[PDB]
Design an enzyme around this catalytic site. Structure first.
Site, PDB file in Angstrom:
ATOM      1  N   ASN A 164      41.127  47.742  40.665  1.00 21.79           N
ATOM      2  CA  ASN A 164      42.244  48.514  41.191  1.00 21.79           C
ATOM      3  C   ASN A 164      42.947  47.823  42.353  1.00 21.79           C
ATOM      4  O   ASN A 164      43.987  48.318  42.809  1.00 21.79           O
ATOM      5  CB  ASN A 164      41.750  49.906  41.590  1.00 21.79           C
ATOM      6  CG  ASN A 164      41.584  50.820  40.375  1.00 21.79           C
ATOM      7  OD1 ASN A 164      42.531  51.511  39.985  1.00 21.79           O
ATOM      8  ND2 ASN A 164      40.405  50.791  39.739  1.00 21.79           N
ATOM      9  N   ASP A 188      41.684  40.917  45.935  1.00 16.51           N
ATOM     10  CA  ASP A 188      42.658  41.914  45.461  1.00 16.51           C
ATOM     11  C   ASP A 188      44.019  41.215  45.372  1.00 16.51           C
ATOM     12  O   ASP A 188      44.831  41.310  46.294  1.00 16.51           O
ATOM     13  CB  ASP A 188      42.744  43.131  46.389  1.00 16.51           C
ATOM     14  CG  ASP A 188      41.393  43.777  46.670  1.00 16.51           C
ATOM     15  OD1 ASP A 188      40.977  44.649  45.880  1.00 16.51           O
ATOM     16  OD2 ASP A 188      40.763  43.430  47.704  1.00 16.51           O
ATOM     17  N   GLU A 201      31.899  41.674  56.803  1.00 17.83           N
ATOM     18  CA  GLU A 201      33.341  41.870  56.973  1.00 17.83           C
ATOM     19  C   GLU A 201      33.678  42.329  58.380  1.00 17.83           C
ATOM     20  O   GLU A 201      34.804  42.116  58.845  1.00 17.83           O
ATOM     21  CB  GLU A 201      33.871  42.894  55.969  1.00 17.83           C
ATOM     22  CG  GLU A 201      33.856  42.447  54.530  1.00 17.83           C
ATOM     23  CD  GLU A 201      34.116  43.617  53.599  1.00 17.83           C
ATOM     24  OE1 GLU A 201      33.159  44.378  53.337  1.00 17.83           O
ATOM     25  OE2 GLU A 201      35.279  43.798  53.166  1.00 17.83           O
ATOM     26  N   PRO A 232      33.001  52.809  39.152  1.00 12.79           N
ATOM     27  CA  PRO A 232      33.202  53.926  38.213  1.00 12.79           C
ATOM     28  C   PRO A 232      33.466  55.215  38.986  1.00 12.79           C
ATOM     29  O   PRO A 232      32.866  55.460  40.037  1.00 12.79           O
ATOM     30  CB  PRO A 232      31.881  53.996  37.433  1.00 12.79           C
ATOM     31  CG  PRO A 232      31.073  52.803  37.866  1.00 12.79           C
ATOM     32  CD  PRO A 232      31.599  52.357  39.189  1.00 12.79           C
ATOM     33  N   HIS A 289      29.153  42.670  49.530  1.00 13.55           N
ATOM     34  CA  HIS A 289      30.117  42.438  50.608  1.00 13.55           C
ATOM     35  C   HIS A 289      29.379  42.394  51.948  1.00 13.55           C
ATOM     36  O   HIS A 289      28.762  43.387  52.351  1.00 13.55           O
ATOM     37  CB  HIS A 289      31.170  43.541  50.625  1.00 13.55           C
ATOM     38  CG  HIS A 289      32.239  43.374  49.596  1.00 13.55           C
ATOM     39  ND1 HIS A 289      31.965  43.280  48.246  1.00 13.55           N
ATOM     40  CD2 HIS A 289      33.583  43.296  49.714  1.00 13.55           C
ATOM     41  CE1 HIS A 289      33.098  43.160  47.580  1.00 13.55           C
ATOM     42  NE2 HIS A 289      34.093  43.168  48.448  1.00 13.55           N
ATOM     43  N   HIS A 312      35.236  37.369  42.142  1.00 10.33           N
ATOM     44  CA  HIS A 312      35.367  38.451  43.122  1.00 10.33           C
ATOM     45  C   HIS A 312      36.789  39.011  43.021  1.00 10.33           C
ATOM     46  O   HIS A 312      37.703  38.635  43.770  1.00 10.33           O
ATOM     47  CB  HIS A 312      35.033  37.965  44.532  1.00 10.33           C
ATOM     48  CG  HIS A 312      34.960  39.061  45.554  1.00 10.33           C
ATOM     49  ND1 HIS A 312      34.037  39.057  46.577  1.00 10.33           N
ATOM     50  CD2 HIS A 312      35.713  40.177  45.732  1.00 10.33           C
ATOM     51  CE1 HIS A 312      34.215  40.126  47.335  1.00 10.33           C
ATOM     52  NE2 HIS A 312      35.229  40.819  46.847  1.00 10.33           N
TER      53      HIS A 312
HETATM   54  N1  LIG Z   1      34.635  46.371  51.584  1.00 11.13           N
HETATM   55  C1  LIG Z   1      35.695  46.063  50.794  1.00 11.13           C
HETATM   56  N2  LIG Z   1      35.898  46.734  49.635  1.00 11.13           N
HETATM   57  C2  LIG Z   1      36.949  46.425  48.844  1.00 11.13           C
HETATM   58  C3  LIG Z   1      37.824  45.420  49.236  1.00 11.13           C
HETATM   59  N3  LIG Z   1      38.765  45.321  48.267  1.00 11.13           N
HETATM   60  C4  LIG Z   1      38.495  46.254  47.322  1.00 11.13           C
HETATM   61  N4  LIG Z   1      37.385  46.918  47.678  1.00 11.13           N
HETATM   62  C5  LIG Z   1      36.753  48.019  46.935  1.00 11.13           C
HETATM   63  O1  LIG Z   1      37.340  48.076  45.647  1.00 11.13           O
HETATM   64  C6  LIG Z   1      37.932  49.376  45.420  1.00 11.13           C
HETATM   65  C7  LIG Z   1      39.157  49.234  44.544  1.00 11.13           C
HETATM   66  O2  LIG Z   1      38.809  48.761  43.251  1.00 11.13           O
HETATM   67  P1  LIG Z   1      38.014  49.694  42.235  1.00 11.13           P
HETATM   68  O3  LIG Z   1      36.537  49.487  42.477  1.00 11.13           O
HETATM   69  O4  LIG Z   1      38.522  51.072  42.517  1.00 11.13           O
HETATM   70  O5  LIG Z   1      38.475  49.157  40.907  1.00 11.13           O
HETATM   71  C8  LIG Z   1      38.200  49.910  46.816  1.00 11.13           C
HETATM   72  O6  LIG Z   1      38.293  51.320  46.838  1.00 11.13           O
HETATM   73  C9  LIG Z   1      37.036  49.353  47.639  1.00 11.13           C
HETATM   74  O7  LIG Z   1      35.890  50.183  47.547  1.00 11.13           O
HETATM   75  C10 LIG Z   1      37.592  44.763  50.455  1.00 11.13           C
HETATM   76  O8  LIG Z   1      38.326  43.830  50.875  1.00 11.13           O
HETATM   77  N5  LIG Z   1      36.522  45.086  51.188  1.00 11.13           N
HETATM   78 ZN   LIG Z   2      36.010  42.496  47.784  1.00 10.23          ZN
END
Ligand SMILES: Nc1nc2c(ncn2[C@@H]2O[C@H](COP(=O)(O)O)[C@@H](O)[C@H]2O)c(=O)[nH]1
Ligand SMILES: [Zn+2]
Length: 338
Positions: free
Chosen positions: A17, A280, A204, A99, A201, A13
């Site tokens: 980004n 993250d 939350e 994407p 997810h 997980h």
């Molecule tokens: N619901 C949720 N989405 C997350 C979280 N961390 C990252 N994301 C998702 O992951 C994205 C960033 O990574 P990406 O998919 O742009 O590579 C965010 O814009 C969000 O949609 C989180 O803690 N909770």
């Molecule tokens: Zn997540």
């Protein structure tokens, strides 16, 4: 701790980004400021001071995406994330990313993912298998809760086309205060009926109806599960759905008030499958080794209990049986050492 750093680990997980190095994010900001596209002091201020509570962190993600949504950058951060996980002895990584479409620069969802693949092909400091340290990498495509059903279907179709470069499943993520399960259920059902693995997810924020509907869908894994109630826990334990546990993330977003009350301890004691993850590590200033350290302290685990926990994650991966057998071999080759 040294032996935790050396432990072979499985990351299930991690958002692309949300996993960017501090210096890389600030370098992208500096370069875009020298071009006049953004005010560097403002962006830097947000990066330093956004408190990263659940509400604030999605504003932070909007800013990150203004810094990172171009093909060369996607390639670069994909390489950097994989190298960072491998250097702390992650041997298997499922990397998830949404994407992105950006017409002004000729980016489609497909060409975004091609830039991710290019990033995997450029990995050099470590050995990599995506379809001297060695890391297996597999890909999850994220549906963002802001999207329409048709846009979610476009992502599922792309995932199916890209099974040949290691896409193994679909994630549902993005702001949990946005969107409705009924929007995404049809696309996720199509993905599941086409044998893609599904992780959601879930919980939350307090949302009893959505939690129950996601559990009834029977995904292959869920992440977080912070605001589950007793009927939710009962259903989850009966369906045996593994939980991606994100300790630091949960504490910082204020979804769990402290590690000492975090549900991962109950899951561990109930012998329910759980996997420690970073979510993250860039946004939340952590690493998978540090998440393990927090868990080992809080639970009072021995070396061999920690190793058994880490190894148990193999059967929650979405990889083919051959890869799992290889991971078993690797973990056994690190077994009697400690
Ligand atoms: N619901 C949720 N989405 C997350 C979280 N961390 C990252 N994301 C998702 O992951 C994205 C960033 O990574 P990406 O998919 O742009 O590579 C965010 O814009 C969000 O949609 C989180 O803690 N909770
Ligand atoms: Zn997540």
């Amino acid at each position: 701790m040294e032996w935790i750093q050396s432990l072979p680990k499985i990351e299930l997980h991690a958002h692309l980004n949300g996993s960017i190095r501090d210096s890389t994010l600030l370098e992208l900001a500096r370069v875009l400021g020298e071009k006049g596209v953004i005010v560097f002091a403002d962006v830097e201020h947000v990066i330093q001071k956004n408190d990263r509570s659940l509400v604030e962190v999605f504003k932070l993600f909007d800013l990150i995406h203004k810094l990172t949504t171009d093909h060369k950058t996607v390639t670069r951060i994909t390489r950097e994330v994989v190298e960072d996980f491998a250097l702390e002895n992650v041997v298997y990584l499922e990397l998830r990313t949404t994407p992105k479409r950006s017409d002004s620069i000729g980016m489609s969802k497909r060409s975004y993912m091609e830039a991710v693949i290019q990033g995997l092909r450029s990995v050099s400091e470590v050995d990599i298998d995506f379809v001297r340290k060695k890391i297996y990498v597999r890909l999850l495509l994220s549906i963002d809760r802001r999207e329409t059903t048709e846009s979610a279907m476009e992502t599922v179709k792309l995932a199916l086309e890209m099974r040949d470069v290691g896409v193994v499943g679909i994630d549902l993520s993005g702001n949990p205060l946005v969107g409705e399960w009924s929007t995404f259920l049809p696309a996720l059902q199509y993905a599941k009926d086409n044998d893609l693995h599904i992780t959601l997810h879930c919980g939350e924020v307090p949302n009893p109806k959505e939690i129950q509907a996601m559990l009834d869908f029977k995904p292959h894994r869920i992440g977080h599960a912070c605001f589950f109630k007793d009927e939710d826990w009962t259903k989850l334990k009966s369906f045996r759905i593994p939980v991606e546990i994100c300790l630091t993330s949960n504490i910082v977003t204020k979804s769990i008030s402290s590690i000492d009350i975090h549900h991962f301890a109950d899951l561990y004691n109930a012998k329910h499958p759980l996997i420690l993850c970073t979510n993250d590590f860039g946004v939340f200033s952590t690493s998978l080794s540090n998440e393990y350290a927090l868990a080992v302290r809080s639970l009072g685990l021995s070396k061999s209990e920690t190793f058994a926990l880490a190894r148990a994650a193999i059967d929650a991966t979405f990889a083919e049986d051959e890869v799992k057998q290889q991971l078993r071999f690797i973990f056994d080759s690190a077994s009697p050492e400690h």
